[PDB]
């Protein structure tokens, strides 16, 4: 479902929201898992890159809006 919605990357919602954003959000929430999707943190502060990391290089803003 991720790789699919990724095709919507250019699709903006009626509020200017990149559909990708919402769809991925509802995705994470509904799916009720982030560790596999967005990664895990190691004790020394290294963020183990997760699923979403493979698709985007800008994991920052993504995880950020997810957290919002």
């Amino acid at each position: 479902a991720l790789q699919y919605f990724y095709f919507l990357r250019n699709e903006k919602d009626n509020q200017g929201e990149s559909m990708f954003l919402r769809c991925v959000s509802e995705l994470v929430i509904e799916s009720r898992e982030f560790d596999m999707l967005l990664g895990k943190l190691e004790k020394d502060g290294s963020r183990k890159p997760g699923a979403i990391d493979k698709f985007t290089r800008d994991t920052k803003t993504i995880i950020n809006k997810v957290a919002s």
Partner: protein, 40 residues
Amino acid sequence: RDDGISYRLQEVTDDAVCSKANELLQRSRHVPNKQEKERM
């Protein structure tokens, strides 16, 4: 040899990628089998 680290280093990677691309392009010159040259 055995995240926050590379971040700190950039504060106080791309060069390795440029080294890899240089290595691949250089190696392409010596490839006899053409499809491998295209791959490289």
